[PDB]
Swiss-Prot record, chains A, B:
This is Uridine phosphorylase 1. The lineage of its organism: Eukaryota, Metazoa, Chordata, Craniata, Vertebrata. Homodimer. Keywords: Glycosyltransferase, Transferase. Catalyzes the reversible phosphorylytic cleavage of uridine to uracil and ribose-1-phosphate which can then be utilized as carbon and energy sources or in the rescue of pyrimidine bases for nucleotide synthesis. Shows broad substrate specificity and can also accept deoxyuridine and other analogous compounds. Its EC number is 2.4.2.3. Uridine binds at residues 127-128, 202-204. One of its GO terms (biological process) is UMP salvage. One of its GO terms (cellular component) is cytosol. It comes from Homo sapiens. It catalyses: uridine + phosphate = alpha-D-ribose 1-phosphate + uracil; 2'-deoxyuridine + phosphate = 2-deoxy-alpha-D-ribose 1-phosphate + uracil. Induction: By vitamin D3 and a mixture of inflammatory cytokines: TNF, IL1/interleukin-1 and IFNG/IFN-gamma. Pathway: Pyrimidine metabolism; UMP biosynthesis via salvage pathway; uracil from uridine (phosphorylase route): step 1/1. SUPFAM superfamilies: Purine and uridine phosphorylases.
Length: 293, 293
């Protein structure tokens, strides 16, 4: 029905291709054999979260592997980790726009080389909330920039280029339905601001550098809230800009680890934080199992 | 004798500080005892390279423990890895400005809490060459942007802020003298262009997306070269800006994996690429040995 597509005429003309940061090559690896059956891709910053994710899905799907292991498909490199259980692939992306951008360029080409179709991609992550209790799960409506607009900007051969951000509306509704059925945590739908710096780029007072006042950053966070922003993270704008352009249905599901209107460091005890950290995995693995049921 | 400094008044008012992405805190770790002897810090993208680096410099210094693991000081998290031997720290930083930015805010705080002084910090890494033979090591003179200027722009509370990039001129000279004495590979001094992204951000033709022609990327690379740029990477601009601000003497030493005027993928056999990858490590460990003897 809907094949993954690239927006690059040069790919067709290449004899072989190397997915440098995955250590996978079309000369050595049989892409349709390895990945042709992939229907769900889940991505997140931490390699150990992504392995925890695949194990969670394994057990949900009863495709479980009880007493046994999920090999890292990227063994041989440590730029990203990658795991697979049935039609589900789990991929780490590190932190920040450039780190996920590289992963996405290589992932989208793998999916294309695998002859994948009807792929859903969901980012699971963590975030700072604005005016939400800690632990709230946010399903992103729009991924927005530091002016609270639905855009991703980058420089390409010296020229400022802008792409619109786009997340599948129907997917947001499907995820919300799952969350209501689960009833295990508060879930809200709102806008997610994506920044390039975690400290000064998100109005923190605890960096090595801070050129502004508590009152300054508070006015900034309030202005974000008024424009519909509910959480803050570092990957969502390029993720939304790229995935739509390539024929993938995409969502972003992040848990808030603190309320930024009240401060900058996490004051949840360790057991409570571990619980928050598995909420996006819980929702998404539940959602996948539903789809495969 | 120059202590590490912070540009943030709020730090003195905090009772404790958690370096979230290192899994270290000031209440649970005696930073002066643990890190107080640090005089050199080497940073790079890959944790496995940074572990290889510490093993290398440990042997140079006569501190090597045949049959002992170097422990990861950041055990408990997988955001970054960190290793130590005597007065040398090795820290991974992942890929891109945001990822290294997080690491540098926390590292500079750590060095401050440890009461370190006269610290030298050197980034080792890989790069795309412009008009250099593959495997050439570039000691960066100025870290430049896509206009080819020695500036780093960031958004702070929705506002553009421009900072100067400053790499220590004396340290460049010392690394150049070291390279001439070692005489194990071609070493040049030149400018290094720092881009946000890797595929379209560096004019490659092999991404999932590509908006320009081979001719247009070639012209842009030629304009970079005419402006003094000899290599291209993804972290030098923010590294230079932050380190100079906080009183660390900083330098960047990268190896070129290809010449981008010839194309975008590595023609080098993998055994050769493996020798190239070890060259910045070789130079900097040698430099540290000289400095400490
Ligand atoms: O405020 C945040 N902002 C943010 O971009 N994230 C993004 O996930 C980034 C890696 O920690 C996560 C948080 C929550 C947080 C708060 C304090 C310490 C660590 C993480
Ligand atoms: O062209 C480059 N540009 C670039 O920013 N780097 C930076 O180190 C980046 C992580 O892959 C490394 C290179 C060398 C290279 C070339 C082809 C494939 C992989 C790496």
């Amino acid at each position: 029905d809907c094949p993954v597509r690239l927006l690059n005429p040069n790919i067709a003309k290449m004899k072989e291709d190397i997915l440098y940061h995955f250590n996978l090559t079309t000369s050595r690896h049989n892409f349709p054999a390895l990945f042709g059956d992939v229907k769900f891709v889940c991505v997140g910053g931490s390699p150990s979260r992504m392995k925890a994710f695949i194990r969670c899905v394994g057990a949900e799907l009863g495709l479980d592997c009880p007493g046994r292991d999920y090999p890292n498909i990227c063994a041989g490199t440590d730029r990203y980790a990658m795991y697979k259980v049935g039609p589900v692939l789990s991929v780490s992306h590190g932190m920040g726009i450039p780190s996920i951008s590289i992963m996405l360029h290589e992932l989208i080409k793998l999916l294309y080389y695998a002859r994948c179709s009807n792929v859903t991609i969901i980012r699971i992550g963590t975030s700072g909330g604005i005016g939400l209790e800690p632990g709230t799960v946010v399903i992103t409506e729009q991924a927005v920039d530091t002016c609270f607009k639905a855009e991703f900007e980058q420089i390409v051969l010296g020229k400022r280029v802008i792409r619109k951000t786009d997340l599948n509306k129907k997917l947001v509704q499907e995820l919300l339905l799952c969350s209501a059925e689960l009833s295990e945590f508060t879930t809200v739908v709102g806008n997610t601001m994506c920044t390039l710096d975690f400290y000064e780029g998100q109005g923190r007072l605890d960096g090595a550098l801070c050129s502004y006042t508590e009152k300054d950053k508070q006015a900034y966070l309030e202005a974000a809230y008024a424009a519909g922003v509910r959480n803050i993270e570092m990957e969502s704008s390029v993720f939304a800009a790229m995935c739509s352009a390539c024929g993938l249905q995409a969502a972003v599901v992040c848990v808030t680890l603190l309320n930024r209107l009240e401060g900058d460091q996490i004051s949840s005890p360790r057991n409570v934080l571990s619980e928050y950290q598995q909420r996006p995995q819980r929702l998404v693995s539940y959602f996948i199992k539903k789809k495969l049921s």
